Symmetry: D2
Subunit: 295 residues, 4 copies
């Protein structure tokens, strides 16, 4: 037997950082969960009990904190690139670093219509994420995403004209509820290294905001023919607005809300045009994915 | 042996309701999870296998949907009171109904600065809840709450002057992070029945809003001496603003964020006045509770 | 306003302890999650920012570890009683301690048919719990429980003869699936203090084992008329076998498995006597409770 | 823009099946959660709102139930292969089916030392899983796994001789706790189609049992030099015992248990040889992966 692939590191490293403006007194907080996995010439730790090639996972944890102390942690694409580059430059035998960062929301509170200098609310479970793969001699590959964005529209969704055979019971519909949790990923063109990532820093926050805005506006405004058709419209728009993106991937569950026939009870009408009360279904759920790239 | 207490019913009943304004085209959605447990002369179902006294839990589920079809589901204090009263009036041998409702957030989307007629976002995991106990001959007892409101302030929290003995290692501090998940409950004066609950309908939403506003403003503005002192200030204010409330209860975890000493690494300064990077602690956590009533 | 009730302490304190037999080389592990909440003359910490009355929650955490170092942690009824008594004896102004312990399963591995001296498996998510309330001048109240015991029987469950009215759609049945997660609590007679708890130490593990054995055998063997009737049989037996128990409480969800009518597809028969494939329902669920005491 | 990749289907389909032996009266239950995602000539559903190419996700759900009614659901490798093959054969334009199955434990109860004919316990949260990819013209690729197997050993784990630099604080150790949740995957050689999968049916359960047995015995008996070294030993053995396996992958968290220094309290000794009470750490955790194949 032989080691075909190996990686190891530290997962679930929670990090908080505060920035304090001495002039204005305003404080800004960042909170993330970080995972770093390393690859390189480490097979002998597996096959020969040779620990000399192991950068201890505990040391990786220390490094994340030190790096956060000495560098900006925003945008996460930059922080991830700095963190990954550190490992491949510092250790001769480490040739790839894989950094995943989940950013948690701490939104500044408005108290009596004015922004508070040091108080924050977790205003959503929505996350902003990055995956950064730093590979020696091959540059920096970055996938940015948003996830956990939960939305619902109560009308202006349709689903008709699908395949019908002996396995089909679903009725065609011209008016249904559509609800989903959005997971959207945009993949950046490969960067040559840190200098290039730094050159594009302003684009990271702007592209996240664009992806979010396009997702929300398209969801709200599209008279949806299917989840498939609506998600494609979202992806097309994002690719149009940022040329440094190579692909956009969406993964959308279809979180079903079922009509409840109450006609058995005093002829109560609660279906079709009369539907007011519905049963949200926890499971099963449709799951629709697509990756959109350039012609 | 004897049955000392018994209750039974249906839990985890998910309900969605839509209101459609025909004039304006605006739609409004409500989503809840409902639990109803009944008590009464039902001991023989336990001791003698006498199912004749059992209103089937499946029938309770049907009743929740029917009641939602035929009545307002907002404010939840009203819906809960209607639902509970139904069971005690309809069934001679059922003498108490216990209704718990969790309301989920579906906040209207703003698209290009204007409110969208039929699109919504789950803008937080914060819940608004009610517990309604409807007891035959004893009226309606209602406890309203908010829960899952997660906040953090990065300064203006202190904790010093606590008891010090041979079990104490905690250092006194004049500047720390304070973060919590707020669970706040206000207990209404007993109502005589549905007519009285209906008479006070406008007070329910207003009191929820007040409790939320007081919680946020007090958290943000108090230079906190302890979680204990800050939460008391919140409760005092709520009781002052709504005379129909008898008690306010808060249950607050103290979600710790620890300093990280980095001095071992090149004399890096990251404690006290120099603290920028912290380690959020998943567990353990302080847990502070208090119930405040009138003199 | 006035403080009507207050308690505070540390929750989610994870503790592991190992016992090493020097003679045999056998090791035994215990893992628990502990919560301790205190009450006493502490109102001024809330109303006056008087921290002098506060035993810091951090100190409570330290105390749990120290107490685990210096005492047996099994049975948990004993450990909880020791821990609670410590706080009321040590601090003049603390008058009640509320200790909750969740015990996690670490079951010794069998390797090649023999018990391994130091390797363990989490063989179930089932917990053994205690709630110990130690109140100055009022002794020690202990509630022992098991929870998270998930079982299913595929036949020998019935449900017929329930109330039928205009809210009822449920069909009577003489053969259904019954599945539940068992939560069973037995309440001990009040103990005068630690000496008395110590006097009964052997009864704690024995009564837990009896409660578990009775629950499993009754579930498996009863041709169940309802969840209500089966759970009463369990409680009756436990009370018969341990005279120091005052009450037994069961809380059982009815985790529904629905028939799937497949007759629309080539006349496939999958209902009644022909039912083979079912749809487990995540929600809603029945919830049945009862507290059984002595005549 | 163009569709680069697309797949869609139904996730979280819960399925239960019962087998009833008419001769012996013994019943056997199976419970699974199934996901099926399809690929093929479906791009126009995304780009042109052409639903004619969509096999509705609801129909996929129906198909899972029908297929479970008409076929064995064990071993899951077989059921998954049948289910996947159905979609590629039935629909001309569907060219790949991706089937994921999670099998839940329902272990027959022993009552008074004898196996009960129709009562079961969820004796662990451990799962047995399969991923089956059925691709038209390319056969059937099967990855079998176990996951959620949680183990702990209290001694006979070491970790010393790792890299030490200015980022390192971890002390070398010759005696520590090792605890992990095992995720182990074995990848079968490609099968040409259903006939070949059927030919190997007995090997599936046997290989699962072997993988489990090897994992447990190796964990218990290895005087572990590192997680890396121990996991390699496991993988090597599995590959030796089943020639139809091409690779074995392990993913193991290192769930840390920290010593607690209590020396500040009355010189209490609880470190090194005196360590009895430890603090289990919820996060962060080491994460160690490896894929082992043949020379
Ligand atoms: O077994 C281990 N492997 C590692 O890579 C490691 N790093 N810290 N502790 C460790 N333990
Ligand atoms: O055992 C049961 N008890 C009940 O109260 C009930 N209601 N519906 N099905 C039921 N099953
Ligand atoms: O606000 C606090 N209250 C307390 O009781 C406490 N104990 N430790 N830290 C604390 N912080
Ligand atoms: O938008 C949808 N897409 C689908 O593929 C589907 N299948 N059932 N309902 C559906 N809705
Ligand atoms: Na390198
Ligand atoms: Na009544
Ligand atoms: Na006392
Ligand atoms: Na095909």
């Amino acid at each position: 037997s032989a080691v075909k692939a190996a990686r190891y590191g530290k997962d679930n490293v929670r990090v908080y950082k505060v920035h304090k403006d001495e002039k204005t007194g305003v404080q800004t907080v960042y909170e993330m969960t970080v995972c770093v996995l390393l690859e390189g010439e480490i097979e002998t730790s597996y096959t020969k009990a040779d620990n000399s090639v192991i950068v201890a996972t505990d040391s990786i944890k220390n490094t994340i904190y030190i790096t956060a102390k000495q560098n900006p942690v925003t945008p996460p694409e930059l922080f991830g690139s700095i963190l990954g580059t550190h490992f491949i430059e510092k250790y001769n035998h480490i040739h790839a670093a894989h950094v995943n960062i989940v950013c948690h929301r701490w939104t500044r509170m408005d108290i009596d219509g004015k922004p508070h200098p040091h108080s924050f609310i977790r205003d959503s479970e929505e996350k902003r994420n990055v995956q950064v793969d730093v590979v020696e001699g091959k540059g920096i590959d970055i996938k940015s995403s948003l996830s956990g964005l939960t939305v619902l529209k109560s009308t202006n969704s349709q689903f008709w004209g699908f395949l019908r055979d002996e396995y089909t019971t679903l009725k065609e519909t011209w008016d249904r509820i559509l609800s989903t949790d959005v997971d959207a990923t945009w993949q950046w063109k490969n960067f040559s290294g840190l200098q290039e990532v730094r050159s594009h820093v302003p684009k990271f926050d702007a592209t996240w905001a664009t992806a979010r805005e396009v997702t929300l506006k398209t969801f709200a405004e599209d008279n949806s023919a299917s989840v498939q058709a609506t998600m494609y419209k979202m992806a097309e728009q994002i690719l149009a607005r940022q040329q440094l993106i190579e692909t956009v991937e969406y993964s959308l569950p279809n979180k079903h809300y079922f009509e409840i026939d109450l006609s058995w009870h005093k002829g109560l009408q609660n279906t079709g045009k009369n539907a007011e009360v519905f049963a949200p279904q926890s499971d099963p759920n449709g799951l629709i994915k697509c990756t959109v790239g350039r012609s």
